[PDB]
Amino acid sequence: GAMNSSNYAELFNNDIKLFVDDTNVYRVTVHKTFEGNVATKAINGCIFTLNPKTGHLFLKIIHTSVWAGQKRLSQLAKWKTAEEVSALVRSLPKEEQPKQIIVTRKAMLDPLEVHMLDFPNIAIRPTELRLPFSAAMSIDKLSDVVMKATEPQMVLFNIYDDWLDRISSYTAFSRLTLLLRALKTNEESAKMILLSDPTITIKSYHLWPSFTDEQWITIESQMRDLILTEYGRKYNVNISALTQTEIKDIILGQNIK
Amino acid sequence: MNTVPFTSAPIEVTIGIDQYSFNVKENQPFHGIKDIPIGHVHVIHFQHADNSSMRYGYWFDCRMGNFYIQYDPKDGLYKMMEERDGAKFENIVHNFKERQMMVSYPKIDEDDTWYNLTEFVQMDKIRKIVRKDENQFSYVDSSMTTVQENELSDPAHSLNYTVINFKSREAIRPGHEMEDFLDKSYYLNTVMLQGIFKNSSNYFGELQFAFLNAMFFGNYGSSLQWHAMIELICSSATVPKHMLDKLDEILYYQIKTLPEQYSDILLNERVWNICLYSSFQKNSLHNTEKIMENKYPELL
Numbered sequence A: 001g002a003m004n005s006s007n008y009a010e011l012f013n014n015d016i017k018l019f020v021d022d023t024n025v026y027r028v029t030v031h032k033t034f035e036g037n038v039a040t041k042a043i044n045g046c047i048f049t050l051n052p053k054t055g056h057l058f059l060k061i062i063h064t065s066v067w068a069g070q071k072r073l074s075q076l077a078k079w080k081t082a083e084e085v086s087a088l089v090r091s092l093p094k095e096e097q098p099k100q101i102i103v104t105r106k107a108m109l110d111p112l113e114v115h116m117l118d119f120p121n122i123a124i125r126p127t128e129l130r131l132p133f134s135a136a137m138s139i140d141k142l143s144d145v146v147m148k149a150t151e152p153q154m155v156l157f158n159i160y161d162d163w164l165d166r167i168s169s170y171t172a173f174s175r176l177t178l179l180l181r182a183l184k185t186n187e188e189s190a191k192m193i194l195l196s197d198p199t200i201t202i203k204s205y206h207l208w209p210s211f212t213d214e215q216w217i218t219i220e221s222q223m224r225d226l227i228l229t230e231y232g233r234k235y236n237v238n239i240s241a242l243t244q245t246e247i248k249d250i251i252l253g254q255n256i257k
Numbered sequence B: 001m002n003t004v005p006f007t008s009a010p011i012e013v014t015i016g017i018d019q020y021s022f023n024v025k026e027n028q029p030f031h032g033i034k035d036i037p038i039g040h041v042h043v044i045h046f047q048h049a050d051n052s053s054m055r056y057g058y059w060f061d062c063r064m065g066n067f068y069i070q071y072d073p074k075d076g077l078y079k080m081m082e083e084r085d086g087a088k089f090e091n092i093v094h095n096f097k098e099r100q101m102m103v104s105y106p107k108i109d110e111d112d113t114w115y116n117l118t119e120f121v122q123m124d125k126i127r128k129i130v131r132k133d134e135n136q137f138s139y140v141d142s143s144m145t146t147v148q149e150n151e152l153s154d155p156a157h158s159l160n161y162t163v164i165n166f167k168s169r170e171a172i173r174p175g176h177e178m179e180d181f182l183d184k185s186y187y188l189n190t191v192m193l194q195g196i197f198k199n200s201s202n203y204f205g206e207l208q209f210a211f212l213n214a215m216f217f218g219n220y221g222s223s224l225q226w227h228a229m230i231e232l233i234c235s236s237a238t239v240p241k242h243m244l245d246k247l248d249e250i251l252y253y254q255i256k257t258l259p260e261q262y263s264d265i266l267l268n269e270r271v272w273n274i275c276l277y278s279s280f281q282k283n284s285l286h287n288t289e290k291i292m293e294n295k296y297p298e299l300l
């Protein structure tokens, strides 16, 4: 059925699965025309296709040429997403094909089901999780490859860097969702937390800084604080009063549709 | 021009003949139905007074043979039978007519309702949907499943409606996924009309037969098939003008005939709202839209 809080461990079992997030496929700037009308200008987008057990990210860059002379772009974007996920599955060897594809948005279900009719044993599922994958374009190296693209391109990343050498997939995913939630809530403050200390850098072959285990605990705490501080600023709530249940409940409540 | 005589009526029963119905008492001297109009299929149907779950009937055409009804106390139902002896049959009918023990098919001269509901329905097409080749008439009941319903169990007692599935390889050409899912013209025109039905008359005949089985038997799978065949047309941008104009007539008479008190079980909100207000054909069904808006505005 739907992927929810009840069935969270299933993300880290040995059945190959992919999350598909389409929220950065069709991206526009809105501007005034010379006549004082409004017009959109598309910018390059991406499909965010992630194996949550391995960290393997299949970033399909959607170049603005895809949209040229097309109508109903927000509708086309879902079908183009399903087309490209379908193409990615067909490109993989049988033993690497997913058993399940979880879409972050329910509007992706019919387009993906129709493109995947040739794969009746691959389950297409929605999720009840509110996942912050829209904030992918706040990861500087992912933003850079998307914006520089002059043509359609697929780029492969490990979104966990080398974390799985030291932590489980469950913990790696929890760290990823906390970082992306913080970047989505207050991007400038999150980047400051990650990047302000110049003695900790990002390896050429990584996306995130080379934090020790103790430095990751500090960073994780600072990200939680950022999310709680922003929830206080949003709702005009004295966060200084809150208890640990209240705080846990607010950060995870944001991970839930 | 003919007559369906009854041996007897040993159990209290509501008898339907087409859109008409009447109550017969246990052991009432009822011996059948006369003055049945030649030129149309007909359906004789039953609902027992002591058990409303017994809801069943027979599609027939008086041009194909001499048919009568006899109660079977073993199987507990009124059975249709064919009499091969023309002289015997004529002699029995004459006796019952002289003793005035038959009800008359109560057709008003001005009233085209039954023609309007069965315009495209042919006995030879019914016999392909309902497979029992040793009889010239077709048994249907409230609980019979469709080939499609059985896929998702006895194949001999099933309604062989044409399978329509919008998320199937049959409905979607590889490479035309968005086009074929958002515009079902390919599926309607090439696969269904040119491919399976051969013409719009056969398509409409099956749509009309599905509606009638839904209405007369409360057959759920028949109701699904009726809505699927409406939705397949309404969801196609490219439909011949003659087919849209005819669909409007077909649906108008179906909506006209539907009992008011059965609208909540026989009409699918999503399909009708989509067909009348969202689909490519939202402006093509003037007569249907007006009767639906005046008779069932709560559904819309």
Ligand SMILES: COc1c(F)c(F)cc(C(=O)O)c1F
Pocket: B005, B006, B007, B068, B069, B070, B082, B083, B088, B089, B092, B093
């Ligand atoms: C209705 O009475 C009939 C009838 F018309 C008929 F053709 C045959 C029989 C019969 O049992 O053999 C019968 F009882």
